[PDB]
Amino acid sequence: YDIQAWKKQCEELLNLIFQCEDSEPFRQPVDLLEYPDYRDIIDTPMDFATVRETLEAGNYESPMELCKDVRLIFSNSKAYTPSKRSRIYSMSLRLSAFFEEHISSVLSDYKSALRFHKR
Ligand SMILES: Fc1ccccc1NCc1cc[nH]n1
Q1: Which residues line ligand 1 (CB under 6 A)?
Q2: Cβ–Cβ contacts within 10 Å for residue 35, how many?
Q3: Most buried residue among 13, 63, 94, 96 by CB atoms closer than 10 A?
Q4: What is each CA distance from 25 to 18, 20, 53, 109, in whole angstroms?
């Protein structure tokens, strides 16, 4: 029933993601000195520190907004990868599976709580 519970749930999920070794390439913005043409392919950079900071600033209204930004981290990795077998891309697929497995109940509980609020 709690319309605000998603925020702490997302904080705890981001804590789990930061503990995951697979998140290391995604914890901070992609370095343009390491990948000079990054912005020629990727229009909207995103990373987990920017997601956490947006959440902690009170700049997400719902877990769907957070989920859209986290998914952008993974679609950027898929768009920039030179191969479907690359190391960083392979790490993003596992991390995406972990994130989707955990965010599902957060989204369901929030949407259910909001429907109850507007009943
Ligand atoms: F070299 C790559 C292979 C596959 C996906 C992404 C990259 N480089 C960009 C990046 C993203 C996060 N860390 N570095």
Answers
A1: 25-26, 30, 35, 77, 80-81, 86, 88-89
A2: 14
A3: 63
A4: 11, 11, 17, 30
Q: Nearest C-alpha to atom 7 of ligand 1 is from which residue?
A: 81
Q: In angstroms, what is the resolution?
A: 1.4
What fold, for 1-119?
Histone Acetyltransferase; Chain A (1.20.920)
User: Which structural technique was applied?
Assistant: X-ray
Give the number of the atom of ligand 1 that is nearest the alpha carbon of residue 26: 12
The Å distance, Cα 67 to ligand 1 centre, comes to 20
**Measured between alpha carbons, how far is residue 35 from residues 80, 99, 104, 113 in Å?**
10, 25, 33, 43
Q: How far is Cα 73 from Cα 60, in angstroms, rounded to an integer? A: 16
